Design an enzyme around this catalytic site. Structure first.
Site, mmCIF file in Angstrom:
data_model
loop_
_atom_site.group_PDB
_atom_site.id
_atom_site.type_symbol
_atom_site.label_atom_id
_atom_site.label_comp_id
_atom_site.label_asym_id
_atom_site.label_seq_id
_atom_site.Cartn_x
_atom_site.Cartn_y
_atom_site.Cartn_z
ATOM 1 C CG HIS A 21 85.326 0.309 -78.682
ATOM 2 N ND1 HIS A 21 84.050 0.822 -78.574
ATOM 3 C CD2 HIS A 21 86.158 1.362 -78.620
ATOM 4 C CE1 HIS A 21 84.109 2.137 -78.483
ATOM 5 N NE2 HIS A 21 85.388 2.493 -78.503
ATOM 6 N N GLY B 185 87.954 9.737 -79.179
ATOM 7 C CA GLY B 185 88.586 9.811 -77.854
ATOM 8 C C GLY B 185 87.553 9.923 -76.746
ATOM 9 C CB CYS C 253 84.716 5.573 -76.612
ATOM 10 S SG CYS C 253 83.984 5.734 -78.269
#
Lengths: 304, 304
Positions: B41, B143, B145
């Site tokens: 993603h 932030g 991830c």
């Protein structure tokens, strides 16, 4: 979202841990620049610990009697001195992994990370608070002495704790990195009882703010209180008194949530008087007091 | 003595964290050998996340569109591929700090350490469990991830988790390092509800053994039970069923304490039925289920 008991990343401290052996005693040392810091009780047998005379015991010790190992490589000890309750072993090599660092003496209620070590090797990291009675509730087995407590500010490690003692009650005592005990404790195996382990009120309030930020709001009520009124209830429940200094420190969390500090005190007052009624706050059934207001802001903003 | 929620020392993983930017999205990557692993993603705008077609979005991306920064130095991307829900960015430099490592897919109830990162920089470390509903309860802001979960066996890092998603309920979902989600979750911003968050019974039992080892014994009673009888009560309280496999895993703690596993089940049964009555066990008012039997043995024996 979510709120966890979070330690500082331990890498910078892992790079500083060494093994220190004197006779049959092995424990941990902290290697910064060309100095290894360790508990002076490294020179004691368990027999010595009952009534040690450290100056007299140290006379029988030479540089070559302090065996310092960094991983599988031996360090050469070129000097040693006693500062309060720590030994400073001068070695011939500066630790190449020395981070920027400071020695700080923390106040009760301040939190820090512990890197638990055995034989100079890190086993784990956890978050602690200096208790109002100057103990900490750690996880320390035989061999863990010289394990250190620390905070990190960006790239500067502030060392605040070195592990020395377990009290017969199974709580922990140690020194700053100048070798001064927190509280009235001594490095002798003797009757040492801790005082009242009061709850760190300003930390509980911070953590209730963390809960609100994270969506746990059931405990917010329609009440307010005053510092004097709140403090009568705190005293009854063995909570530390709340000062205007604490109210000031909580101001940013007050601002962010729009909950006046004294309104949050009134919520805490009802939780003390009413209990949790089998409910939880951020996954806890008791009021957490090992997050400082600084910790809550750091974790809620994602500081690195 | 003492028993703490303890994370693995994070140094070996800190050495692997990088920043990955694609267009306006920045998150974290894991740099092992000459491959950087990150959530796929990274290629999505928040708009894309509502209904992403990853293959179609990836067609518009080239090696030079993936910006990989390790501290203040840029890595050159020489290839990229999608494996399930992760991207593998081939870089021209092998990570010099690559530890010995494995990729493992853990089972529900297994614990691990998370190194929370923002912009490739570690902010903190905490201990998690894979919940029976295949969520984790983490602390993850925008932030975070590409932050990873891991266990260490001496000097081998077993990576088990990479952070991808927060559910609308504020619980967390992610993948193993082959990019397969734990549980039924997908990397799409959609109605995804977690199933029942049951309690990890074998972990609670381990932690009651930890409590006995550490001197907290008030909850030990005069009773025993059977697996079938215990399991009727477990079901009623949304505890996971206990299997003979779990009894076998607890055998060493049974041996050390001299408390038969089924006697400890009978203590747990009374705690479920009676509550804590305002008492604590190892400083907790609720029964802790994020220590595995392996965790209890490790911490009670001081493994490094």
């Amino acid at each position: 979202s979510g709120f966890r008991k979070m330690a500082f990343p331990s890498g910078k401290v892992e790079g500083c841990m060494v093994q220190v052996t004197c006779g049959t005693t092995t424990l941990n040392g902290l290697w910064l620049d060309d100095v290894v810091y360790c508990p002076r009780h490294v020179i004691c047998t368990s027999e010595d610990m009952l009534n040690p005379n450290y100056e007299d015991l140290l006379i029988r010790k030479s540089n070559h009697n302090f065996l310092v190992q960094a991983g599988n490589v031996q360090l050469r000890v070129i000097g040693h001195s006693m500062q309060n309750c720590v030994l400073k072993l001068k070695v011939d090599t500066a630790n190449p992994k020395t981070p920027k660092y400071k020695f700080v003496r923390i106040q009760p209620g301040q939190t820090f990370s512990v890197l638990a070590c055995y034989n100079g090797s890190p086993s784990g990291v956890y978050q602690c608070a200096m208790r109002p009675n100057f103990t900490i509730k750690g996880s320390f087995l035989n061999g863990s002495c010289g394990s250190v407590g620390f905070n990190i500010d960006y790239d500067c490690v502030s060392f605040c704790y070195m592990h020395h003692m377990e009290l017969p009650t199974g709580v922990h005592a140690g020194t700053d990195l100048e070798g001064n005990f927190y509280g009235p404790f001594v490095d002798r195996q003797t009757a040492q009882a801790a005082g009242t382990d009061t709850t760190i009120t300003v930390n509980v309030l911070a953590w209730l703010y963390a809960a609100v930020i994270n969506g746990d709001r059931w405990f917010l009520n329609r009440f307010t209180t005053t510092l004097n009124d709140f403090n009568l209830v705190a005293m009854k429940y063995n909570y530390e008194p709340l000062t205007q200094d604490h109210v000031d420190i909580l101001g940013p969390l007050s601002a962010q949530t729009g909950i006046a500090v004294l309104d949050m005190c009134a919520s805490l007052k009802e939780l003390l008087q009413n209990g949790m009624n089998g409910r939880t706050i951020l996954g806890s059934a008791l009021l957490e007091d090992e997050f400082t207001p600084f910790d809550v802001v750091r974790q809620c903003s994602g500081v690195t």
